[PDB]
Ligand binder design. Structure first.
Ligand code: UD1
Length: 331
């Protein structure tokens, strides 16, 4: 029958859901999506060929519930899977009111306010990171099959310039856009890596000028759809510690320098704890300090191979199947 997937806002909620949508489709189920206007599901969900049902101070919360109650009443789904955003709260409750089974998924290291409110009413609570829910099943984060790379995906580092990928993420954090050109100018041009910077949608034009003025050289973009290609090119990542970028770095088996209820700092810790990632706090690390940290791994790239070997082992390839298996066991 029909399946309802509720997710929106940023890529961290929309992308694990698009991967779940592909899995339900291969099993012979009709997937329908639950979103809100303005969010990024309006860009991605219609492109995937999937039906987008849109939802819109307590009287405002009830308006969202009526619309969600209607969408569920019309689709009579076998299961409803929530993944994050404003949508899951009124959507997940609507699912219970109509006696339709509900499964929730938490991408982050600390559970979200909606996921904490919805967990007691869900049949299965799927978690990405361990210890996030005090109880439930640890599936990991559902990552796009294409983002899974082996240690043969890239050329040896020895006698080659390192490729540096700077990630936004989904909206394109600002800071990083400022810190990177200033920091990269202090790194000798003999060791300076090749740069691909994913700035914001409104910050791509300005981040280009920032690199241009300090005389660096980078391929600055607002957003990259060709992510499997972006990860294969990269030897090192300097990123934001959003749930999916963290889980994708493991699938891609990539060393990272992460700049993160302190959800991101905890997300970064799961890489850091094993030696897969390196924690660089925003409030502390200046342009001089990032340059010095980069300089040591460029001078000694064998460091990147150990970080990559550890990252590859933290990947959870069955994250998508087990989330969908948890939905279809209760459906
Ligand atoms: C600033 C902010 O509020 N960030 C939050 C946001 O992160 P956000 O969703 O922005 O970042 P995440 O790392 O969670 O997810 C990024 C997703 O967007 C994709 N991507 C991004 C850029 C691009 O060029 N192409 C592309 O496909 C990534 O491959 C990945 O699939 O949502 C999450 C909520 O669950 C949290 O972890 C973050 O703290």
């Amino acid at each position: 029958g029909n399946v309802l997937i509720m997710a929106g806002g940023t890529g961290g909620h929309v992308f694990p859901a698009l991967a779940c949508a592909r899995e339900f489709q291969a099993r012979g189920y009709a997937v329908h999506w639950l979103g809100t206007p303005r969010g990024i599901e309006n860009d991605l969900v219609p492109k995937a060929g999937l039906p987008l049902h849109l939802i819109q101070a307590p009287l405002e919360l009830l308006k969202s519930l009526f619309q969600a109650l209607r969408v569920i009443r019309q689709l009579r789904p076998v299961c409803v899977l929530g993944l994050g955003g404003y949508v899951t709260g009124p959507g997940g409750l609507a699912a219970r009111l109509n006696g339709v089974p509900l499964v929730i998924h938490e991408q982050n290291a600390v559970a979200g306010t909606a996921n904490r409110s919805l967990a007691p009413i869900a049949r299965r609570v799927c978690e990405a990171f361990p210890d996030t829910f005090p109880a439930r099943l640890t599936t990991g984060n559902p990552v796009r099959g294409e983002l899974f790379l082996d240690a043969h995906a890239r050329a040896p580092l020895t006698g080659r310039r390192v490729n540096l990928l700077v990630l936004g993420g989904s909206l394109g954090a600002e800071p990083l856009n400022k810190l990177l050109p200033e920091a990269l100018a202090q790194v000798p041009l003999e060791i300076r890596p090749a740069i691909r910077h994913q700035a914001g949608r409104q910050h791509a034009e300005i981040t280009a000028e920032r690199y241009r003025t300090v005389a660096v050289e980078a391929d600055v973009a607002p957003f990259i759809s060709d992510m499997a290609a972006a990860y294969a090119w990269a030897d090192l990542v300097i990123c934001r510690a959003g749930a999916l970028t963290v889980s994708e770095l493991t699938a891609a088996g990539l060393p990272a320098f992460l700049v993160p209820d302190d959800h991101q700092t905890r997300n970064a810790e799961f890489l850091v704890r094993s030696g897969a990632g390196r924690l660089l706090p925003q409030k502390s690390t200046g342009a001089a300090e990032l340059a010095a940290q980069l300089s040591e791994v460029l001078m000694h790239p064998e460091t990147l191979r150990s970080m990559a070997d550890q990252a590859r082992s933290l990947a959870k390839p069955e994250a998508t199947r087990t989330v969908v298996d948890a939905c279809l066991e209760v459906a």
